[PDB]
Design an enzyme around this catalytic site. Structure first.
Site, PDB file in Angstrom:
ATOM      1  N   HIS A 106       9.877  14.200   2.289  1.00 20.36           N
ATOM      2  CA  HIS A 106      10.806  14.825   1.353  1.00 20.36           C
ATOM      3  C   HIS A 106      10.284  16.118   0.770  1.00 20.36           C
ATOM      4  O   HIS A 106       9.064  16.356   0.711  1.00 20.36           O
ATOM      5  CB  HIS A 106      11.182  13.849   0.229  1.00 20.36           C
ATOM      6  CG  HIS A 106      10.002  13.309  -0.521  1.00 20.36           C
ATOM      7  ND1 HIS A 106       9.366  12.141  -0.159  1.00 20.36           N
ATOM      8  CD2 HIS A 106       9.330  13.784  -1.599  1.00 20.36           C
ATOM      9  CE1 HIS A 106       8.355  11.918  -0.979  1.00 20.36           C
ATOM     10  NE2 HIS A 106       8.315  12.894  -1.868  1.00 20.36           N
ATOM     11  N   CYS A 165       0.862  -1.206   0.000  1.00 20.73           N
ATOM     12  CA  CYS A 165       0.000   0.000   0.000  1.00 20.73           C
ATOM     13  C   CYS A 165       0.874   1.223   0.000  1.00 20.73           C
ATOM     14  O   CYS A 165       2.053   1.199   0.387  1.00 20.73           O
ATOM     15  CB  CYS A 165      -0.961  -0.026   1.194  1.00 20.73           C
ATOM     16  SG  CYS A 165      -0.238   0.553   2.704  1.00 20.73           S
ATOM     17  N   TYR A 176      10.886  18.381  -2.753  1.00 24.52           N
ATOM     18  CA  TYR A 176      11.485  18.523  -4.089  1.00 24.52           C
ATOM     19  C   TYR A 176      12.374  19.765  -4.158  1.00 24.52           C
ATOM     20  O   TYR A 176      12.037  20.807  -3.595  1.00 24.52           O
ATOM     21  CB  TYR A 176      10.413  18.480  -5.201  1.00 24.52           C
ATOM     22  CG  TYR A 176       9.942  17.058  -5.397  1.00 24.52           C
ATOM     23  CD1 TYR A 176       8.829  16.568  -4.721  1.00 24.52           C
ATOM     24  CD2 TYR A 176      10.672  16.177  -6.178  1.00 24.52           C
ATOM     25  CE1 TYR A 176       8.425  15.240  -4.858  1.00 24.52           C
ATOM     26  CE2 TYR A 176      10.282  14.854  -6.326  1.00 24.52           C
ATOM     27  CZ  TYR A 176       9.166  14.384  -5.664  1.00 24.52           C
ATOM     28  OH  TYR A 176       8.803  13.056  -5.822  1.00 24.52           O
ATOM     29  N   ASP A 196       5.308  13.925   0.093  1.00 20.65           N
ATOM     30  CA  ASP A 196       5.719  15.143  -0.590  1.00 20.65           C
ATOM     31  C   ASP A 196       5.323  16.332   0.299  1.00 20.65           C
ATOM     32  O   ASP A 196       4.144  16.714   0.329  1.00 20.65           O
ATOM     33  CB  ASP A 196       4.937  15.182  -1.915  1.00 20.65           C
ATOM     34  CG  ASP A 196       5.223  16.413  -2.745  1.00 20.65           C
ATOM     35  OD1 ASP A 196       4.950  16.352  -3.968  1.00 20.65           O
ATOM     36  OD2 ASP A 196       5.713  17.428  -2.195  1.00 20.65           O
TER      37      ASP A 196
END
Ligand code: 0MZ
Ligand code: 0MZ
Lengths: 251, 251
Positions: A196, A135, A198, A158
């Site tokens: 994290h 999952c 970007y 994100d």
């Protein structure tokens, strides 16, 4: 009591300082930390972040779409499949497969102490890739003293785009389930594996960091609703939402 | 750098003070908090708790048993099935089913950035109970800079008995996988849903709280090992373990 959004701000700060460089699937640069957790109260408040305007309408609409069980991508034209991925919440169709969402609701009603009140979401790109695919997210519910709490574990988060949207999504889901089970919302707990940022979100986030959170708004459900399938967008009202300006994170 | 065991001690303290009363399956009294997380460094140290003597031999032996894939309960006579439940780590037999453990190891080798390096364990009592039964625990691995980290999410955690044993078990597992993949152990992150203390463990735990942690020991692997199935109990040596006395939690 400090503002819950400070947790989110502190996690961004922590990733910017201590995050290490790590590539994603497409190899496009992030700063990464493994293992994080934040707790947001749902008690007479709703964790729609204030240091940037969060697209509430899309949150609501997409959650409703998932509760429907819809696979018609255009069935979601309310005006890249992430970051919620609720495609298997209802079916695996009017009775084919396990209905995870309905099972969560029933268990809460038949045995509120259960430690197994769990629902999972998969990234659809993973399904044909292998058997027993992991999952993307597991959602665990918890009841004590007539309060419903929710913990979301995501294998990756994100921080710039997905996380604030997910916080609002699962908070909203918890409000809905509490409403139809006769409980009060308790806590939303958000836990990440690979948390994290970007590279291209860094500067926008550094600016967001300098913004002071304002009191979270409230969510009102305007009607008495009986089954999770019965909610409509119109039954919901966010009030007292006074956010800083929209920030465009350019994915 | 403060002692990692302080996290565990702080969580006990937090449950004693703010935990709410909640019954388990058999209805036998706990103090409960929902949602917790602790981080234990594995870098030149091993998180075998020091405020009471932890049964290391049973940790090692039981983990080895699970890596074997054994279902012969008496095959584990190295001198209530919990709290690790690694029964489906290898098979779902010499090639029947998905081999979760081997898949984790292979992915780490073929794609260390993968965000899907995940292995689940089920409480066997759940299996006949329903289709798509929720796991008891999910284990996620993470690689950056030649360091292997591990996060364990358990839907519930017995703080007095199970948790310290699980911390050592998954730390040991991480040491093993790091060893055979040519990586260094990084962090073990332990995350709980329903984190709880049984009523009868309260007084023993209150006493344990007044004990000062001592430096964590080290774990040495004494031989060069190639495949996860090849480890034997004799390849492992805990050194510098200077714990406070055994505490009997009477289950
Ligand atoms: O564009 C998106 C992306 C959404 S938005 C999102 N996450 N949002 C994060 C976010 C939104 C607003 C403010 C701050 C945020 O961090 N995730 C998604 O899947 N969805 C969408 C909305 C309306 C219409 C369409 C369509 F169908 F493609 F035209 C897509
Ligand atoms: O008695 C147990 C229980 C173990 S021990 C455990 N958790 N231990 C926690 C713990 C151990 C030592 C010190 C502190 C701790 O918190 N969980 C288990 O499954 N296992 C066992 C060991 C040897 C032999 C047998 C057998 F087979 F039943 F005889 C069982």
């Amino acid at each position: 009591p400090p503002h819950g959004e400070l947790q989110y701000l502190g996690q961004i700060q922590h990733i910017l300082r201590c995050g290490v460089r790590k590539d994603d699937r497409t190899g496009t640069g992030t700063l990464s930390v493994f293992g994080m957790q934040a707790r947001y109260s749902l008690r007479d408040e709703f964790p729609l972040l204030t240091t940037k305007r969060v697209f509430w309408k899309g949150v609501l609409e997409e959650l409703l779409w998932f509760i429907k069980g819809s696979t018609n991508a255009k069935e979601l034209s309310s005006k890249d499949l992430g970051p919620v991925y609720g495609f298997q919440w209802r079916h695996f169709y009017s009775g084919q497969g396990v209905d995870q969402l309905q099972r969560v609701i029933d268990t809460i009603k038949t045995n509120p102490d259960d430690r197994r009140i769990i629902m999972c979401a998969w990234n659809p790109r993973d399904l044909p890739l292998m058997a027993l695919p992991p999952c993307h997210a597991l959602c665990q519910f918890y009841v004590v003293n007539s309060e419903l709490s929710c913990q979301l574990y995501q294998r990756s988060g994100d921080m710039g785009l997905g996380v604030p949207f997910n916080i609002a999504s699962y908070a909203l889901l918890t409000y809905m389930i509490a409403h139809i089970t006769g409980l009060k919302p308790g806590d939303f707990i958000h836990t990440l594996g690979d948390a994290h940022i970007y590279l291209n979100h860094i500067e926008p986030l550094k600016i967001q960091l300098q913004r002071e959170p304002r009191p979270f708004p409230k969510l009102r459900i305007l009607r008495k609703v009986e089954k999770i399938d019965d909610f409509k967008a119109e039954d919901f009202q966010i009030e007292g939402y006074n956010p800083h300006p929209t920030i465009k994170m350019e994915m």
